[PDB]
Structure formats: structure tokens, C-alpha cells
Amino acid sequence: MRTLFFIPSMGSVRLPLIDFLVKNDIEYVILSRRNHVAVQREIALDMFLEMKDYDTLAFLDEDVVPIEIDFQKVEAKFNEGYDVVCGYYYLKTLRGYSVYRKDWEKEIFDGEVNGCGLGFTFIKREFLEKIKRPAFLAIGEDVYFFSTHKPRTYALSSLKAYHFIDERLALSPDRKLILQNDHVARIKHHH
Amino acid sequence: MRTLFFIPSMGSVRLPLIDFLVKNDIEYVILSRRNHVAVQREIALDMFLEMKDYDTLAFLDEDVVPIEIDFQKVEAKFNEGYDVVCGYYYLKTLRGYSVYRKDWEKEIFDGEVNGCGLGFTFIKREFLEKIKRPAFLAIGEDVYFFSTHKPRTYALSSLKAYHFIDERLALSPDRKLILQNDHVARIKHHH
């Protein structure tokens, strides 16, 4: 499985996300600011669909920094017939976690869900090639996407991320505040 | 010649600089926020001196985005016995260009200068291994560095950069405002 990350930005990327991108050899498109995030997500879908080497479109909000991604567990869920695999981070709205059934979840679990906020979310090509386009419309384009297109959706507890508030302080998946203030290096020849 | 870029940041990097970093296969350390830029520059010097595979410490401010770098012209100047090679961008203070003799220069030229603002600046190891440490102290650590350590310093007109004001709008080296609002991609498999 080959994944292309699309990161909606406001024109910059915080260091902790740069570090994740470098350390994990991630392939991505960081989207410059547009009128609204829904417009960026539609652009992402358009670009993704043309880029046939990529099997999975991963949306990652610029303030969401994965702790670990078990890509084989994500791939396993798609193979089993899920359309969308959701990861967990705590919302900056303080309303709960980034996945929902009847409401934003209060606790992390592995299970089928109704949707998520599109901030840490893997979507398979097969599903996206079938959906009516344009696909994201803005409540948000997140509830719209799920309510309208009804993907078979699974939340993995093994997908966890920090949700950064500023460049250094983040909400951790254990609902604590953490601080990450390290430098970020891309060095190929420190022998 | 192998160059390690040190980029003092406030915890994020604007897209246009990410694009420069990716497109040009740059090796770097982006420095997280500290008390003051002088502290970041000293940390940079300490790290650089230990990393013996790197011949040149390049400082690049996070809001400075090179247009072109002729690395062979930089290397040529070091071979000729310069210690520091300075590039040009227009200051956001609007006072002139980033290099000075008696004052900030009003026009771009190839020639020996007294110093620059340390925002687009290549410094050779030989010089840095000789200087009294600690080396940067904050007027700024830029005038201090040059006034105190008196490197043999050359400004190359072939080193030009944009000086970004926000994430998209920049002062160009021709003293005009330009806008860069493209997405930034790192994609290895668009076949």
C-alpha cells in the first residue's frame, strides 16, 4: 500500500510535523491556504485521483502529529472492506476525540464508527473513485463527507496523534498537555 | 563542499522555504525557538563544529528563501581565502539590502563587504574552528559577529533570496512585492 498525505495548511508547518514527515519518509502535498479547508480537500481529491501510484489518500491536519501509524493495520482494514480508517487525537474544541458515532467519542476504542474530523484519516482509492464529485462541502465538510457518502469507516486505537495548540504545546491522546521543543534535522552525512 | 543549513525558527516553517528545502535536497537543522536568536546561532555553531562531514555552516533565516545559489561560486570564494560569503535579500526594516559596508547597501553588487544580517550567509569551517567561543552575542549578534571576529567577507550578487513577510507575500531582490501561494509536494512515485 502506498499512501499520499495531504496536509491542509495556512501557509506554514510546525516543527513537530516536519519532524514526523522527515523521520517517516512521508510522501505528501502540503496545501497552501485557500478560501476554506473544504476547497483544499477537494483540490487534494483531484490531485490524488490523477496520481495512480498512490492507493490511499491520507488527510493529516497541519496541527496533527502522529505518534505511531501501524500502516499494516490500516491496510488490513481496507483489505477487509473498510473505505476509511480513522485515527485518534483529542479535539481543540475540548469536545472529545476526533471520531464519532452519536457524538465525539469520550474514549479511545477499536471499532466501526460513523465518521471523524478528516484530520487523521486514511481513505482508499476504490472508494474515492466511486464517489460523486465534488466530494467535500462546508457544519463542516467532515460531517458532510460522512453523512453524504457513507463510507464503511473503522477507528483504530493504534492510530494516535498529538493535537498541537501552538508550535510546541499539544494535547496528547491521554488528554494531557505535552511540550515538544526539539530542533528538527535532516542530515544524511553525520558520519 | 558540503553545506549544513541552520535555520533559526519560531517553531514553524513557511511553505515557500519547505519547497526550497525539498527541491534542492538541502541538509539542515531547523532550530526551535529559544530565548533569543543569538542563542539559536550559538547552538548551531556547537552542533556544526561536531559534525565534521560538513565544511560550511549556512545560516538561513526561516523567512529568507533563496532564488538561486551557485554553490560553486560560494566555494570558489572560500578557496580564494574568504571566511564568509553573504547573499542578498531586501530587509523588512526597509533600510536596504542584507549586506553592509558603512551602512545597509542600497544596491546589489559583487564585492568585499564588512558584514551582513546572518540570514543568508555561508561560513567556512576553518574560520569557525579558530574563532573565540561563544561567538554570537546580542545591537544584534550579526554586527557583533562581524565587528568582533572580523571575517574576510564577500557579497555575491549571484546569491539572491525573497524575504517573506507573511506565508505568501515577499520582498523580492528587485524591491518589489511578490506572492507565492503554491502547494508544496514531496512525491517520489508519480509515474
Ligand code: NI
Ligand atoms: Ni556520507
Ligand code: NI
Ligand atoms: Ni516508484
